[PDB]
Design a protein around this ligand. Structure first.
Ligand code: B12
Ligand code: B12
Ligand code: B12
Ligand SMILES: Nc1ncnc2c1ncn2[C@@H]1O[C@H](COP(=O)(O)OP(=O)(O)OP(=O)(O)O)[C@@H](O)[C@H]1O
Ligand SMILES: Nc1ncnc2c1ncn2[C@@H]1O[C@H](COP(=O)(O)OP(=O)(O)OP(=O)(O)O)[C@@H](O)[C@H]1O
Ligand SMILES: Nc1ncnc2c1ncn2[C@@H]1O[C@H](COP(=O)(O)OP(=O)(O)OP(=O)(O)O)[C@@H](O)[C@H]1O
Ligand SMILES: [Cl-]
Ligand SMILES: [Cl-]
Ligand SMILES: [Cl-]
Ligand SMILES: [Cl-]
Ligand SMILES: [Cl-]
Ligand SMILES: [Cl-]
Ligand SMILES: [K+]
Ligand SMILES: [K+]
Ligand SMILES: [K+]
Ligand SMILES: [K+]
Ligand SMILES: [K+]
Ligand SMILES: [K+]
Ligand SMILES: [Mg+2]
Ligand SMILES: [Mg+2]
Ligand SMILES: [Mg+2]
Lengths: 181, 181, 181
């Protein structure tokens, strides 16, 4: 059964099987990445005919987030369990999308309100959940050795979600709204 | 008026009327349960003709979450205020649903990406918000005596949301996607 | 480029340019306000013909939340950067809406389940995210001097979202459901 009940008193296992409390900074870090991954799934479910071009990359992000979570759940000192996530290829992939979407949409010099279409608005929610997960990752980094490649990718990912949100509005001919002061 | 302004300097009351700061671990715990309850309401609003079978149980979860929040807001040592939540019946109810939904959907041996239909994706968001609330409950448990029955139910509840998310995809003939490595 | 990479090791700048870790209580506070602002954008995107009357005020809240975030990112002691947010006018505006929406909808004497229409349910999610951001603001207040006007408005704002959620249900002829005990 998926329910083992071993977590009923508030403790759980990480990779390698060491037991931690569920509020441990490590468990909060990969838990927030799981929350982000679920929100990306929700965002993907809002795609329509006008925004289908974004579907493949959202699913790829979900696969990458699983790799990131895996590494966050992995203690550095247990040599039986290696980190799997390498930032270079996925991060350059995000950057290419950021550059492309920044070029195509109307240039702004002011902050935008996070909103517009349902999909663009969901991409802004994704942007802010990514940044929340990043804060938890940094809390963990300050106490334990982490795969720093995960932090590089998670940082870049919220810039991706910002650029993708603007692109989603552009795909539905929805202008962005500027902050008034 | 619902606005009393007594909370304007960042303090508030729990059951029994003792005053705590709004960032107190207790207030964060039942606040996260309120956030979960609101997300379950949102998830319920996404039900359609194909997924109506899930409506009653989502509303029942909302009623149960109110009982859970009540107990988390109740200090153990104030004998004027008793715990109301007893885990056995609601938890066995969740387990029966987990068993039923696990049986009906295609068996997997790999992790799934959290996503699919809008409803299944919302049920995965519910799964991860439940787990976030659980972490806050454990933070509170480590400082204060709690109704441990709430923790048992909240633990089981995120396994319910996982099984229900797979079932929602099944109800709309949407396959789950496997993690690639 | 929007990606500078200066945040790749988990530190970032606030207003005035001092560097903090991304898990610093200040950065968590205005980060949670950004998350709220994105959720308000998402909520606004769910408006339909029956609920158009709520569109202007949601966008106004988004502009106000930017002012609030600005002040939370501003250290009190750096006199080069003044607080911009003054609570009186926006807070009285919220209160007038609370009074109006409380009058129009069916009176209750019991707690309601947070749910109903998709929009009303999203307004309850907004209510609980506002309250989460409030907890982070109070964490910051307990360590650093803040613009206390932001806390007054953020407190009142979750009462606004509660009253607006009930009003959204009323606009679509959806009754609220009461807590059963
Ligand atoms: C880390 C981990 C995860 C991570 C995975 C990635 C990450 N790090 O962020 C996260 C937090 C996402 C996760 C989620 C869940 N998991 Co998990 N997970 C673990 C854990 C602790 C380690 C697995 C491991 O060592 N892998 C290391 C490598 C070398 O092996 P691997 O084959 O590549 O491992 C993969 C699988 O374990 C897979 N996976 C992870 N969880 C689950 C759950 C199920 C049902 C399946 C089929 C596969 C699977 O992901 C791993 C790759 O990253 C184990 C504990 C244990 N006793 O095994 C549980 C454990 C496997 N997971 C469990 C469960 C129940 C869940 C959830 C259903 C919980 C929930 N209600 O949300 C979810 C959703 C699963 C999904 N999406 O399909 C149970 C499964 C019990 C069972 N007999 O079915 C276990 C055994 C824990 C327990 N309670 O004892 N989990
Ligand atoms: C605990 C509590 C809650 C909990 C309830 C369950 C939980 N523990 O998680 C939570 C956090 C969910 C909650 C939410 C809210 N509450 Co409240 N709640 C309290 C509190 C602290 C204790 C109530 C109590 O002692 N009950 C113990 C038992 C023995 O009595 P009871 O009749 O069963 O109590 C029930 C009611 O209080 C009901 N309830 C809880 N909140 C509210 C709000 C309203 C308007 C109504 C009609 C009923 C109601 O839930 C209780 C059962 O669990 C009081 C403080 C106080 N001064 O009374 C406020 C208080 C009742 N709540 C208040 C408010 C405004 C709210 C919110 C509208 C805040 C918001 N903006 O989100 C929401 C939403 C309410 C809803 N869904 O209808 C105000 C009501 C003021 C008024 N005159 O209308 C109070 C008085 C606090 C205050 N500011 O002084 N709250
Ligand atoms: C505070 C701040 C914010 C706050 C704004 C309000 C708040 N306090 O909550 C928040 C957290 C919301 C924010 C968000 C983002 N920001 Co910002 N922000 C800052 C910061 C630290 C201070 C700005 C300042 O001093 N203003 C003070 C007053 C006197 O000047 P001002 O003209 O009124 O400032 C306004 C603009 O800066 C505007 N703004 C804020 N961020 C951004 C980003 C862009 C692209 C634009 C055009 C405008 C803009 O908001 C301010 C008014 O409150 C700077 C750091 C820096 N080096 O400048 C970055 C910085 C401007 N932001 C940056 C970025 C990338 C972002 C995000 C895209 C990050 C993301 N992926 O989510 C988002 C979204 C922006 C949006 N909605 O359009 C980058 C811009 C780099 C570039 N060359 O494009 C900067 C330079 C930080 C960095 N990485 O070096 N940020
Ligand atoms: N509340 C939580 N937040 C984040 N991560 C969690 C949480 N609970 C468990 N985990 C992590 O996710 C994995 C799968 O969760 P699962 O709920 O199966 O664990 P458990 O709660 O320890 O056991 P069980 O639910 O069977 O009693 C755990 O092995 C642990 O690594
Ligand atoms: N930010 C918050 N997060 C979680 N729980 C809260 C928060 N603020 C208040 N509470 C809890 O929810 C109850 C209802 O909230 P409410 O906003 O009415 O309280 P308040 O902020 O203390 O008062 P007011 O908003 O009238 O100034 C409170 O009595 C307290 O138990
Ligand atoms: N994870 C986060 N959570 C909340 N606020 C953040 C976070 N990261 C950065 N900030 C704040 O938001 C502003 C804009 O974020 P941005 O991502 O551009 O910053 P950075 O991560 O420091 O730099 P970069 O992403 O270019 O490496 C920052 O200047 C800082 O004030
Ligand atoms: Cl071994
Ligand atoms: Cl600006
Ligand atoms: Cl008494
Ligand atoms: Cl797997
Ligand atoms: Cl200067
Ligand atoms: Cl009640
Ligand atoms: K489990
Ligand atoms: K290792
Ligand atoms: K109130
Ligand atoms: K008691
Ligand atoms: K950036
Ligand atoms: K200042
Ligand atoms: Mg960054
Ligand atoms: Mg569990
Ligand atoms: Mg309040």
């Amino acid at each position: 059964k998926i329910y083992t009940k071993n977590g009923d008193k508030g403790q759980t296992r990480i990779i390698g099987k060491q037991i931690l409390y569920k509020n441990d900074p490590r468990v909060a870090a990969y838990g927030e990445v799981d929350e982000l991954n679920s929100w990306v799934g929700y965002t993907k479910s809002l795609i329509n005919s006008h925004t289908q071009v974004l579907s493949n990359e959202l699913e790829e992000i979900q696969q990458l987030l699983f790799d990131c979570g895996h590494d966050l759940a992995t203690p550095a000192d247990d040599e039986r369990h290696s980190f799997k996530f390498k930032q270079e290829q996925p991060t350059v992939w995000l950057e290419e999308k950021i550059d492309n979407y920044t070029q195509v949409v109307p240039a702004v010099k002011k902050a935008i309100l996070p909103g517009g279409t349902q999909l663009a608005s969901a991409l802004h929610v994704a942007r802010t959940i990514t940044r929340r997960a990043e804060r938890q990752i940094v809390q963990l980094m300050r106490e334990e050795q982490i795969n720093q490649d995960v932090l590089i990718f998670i940082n870049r990912l919220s810039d991706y979600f910002f650029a993708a949100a603007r692109y989603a509005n552009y795909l539905e001919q929805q202008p962005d709204m500027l902050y008034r002061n």
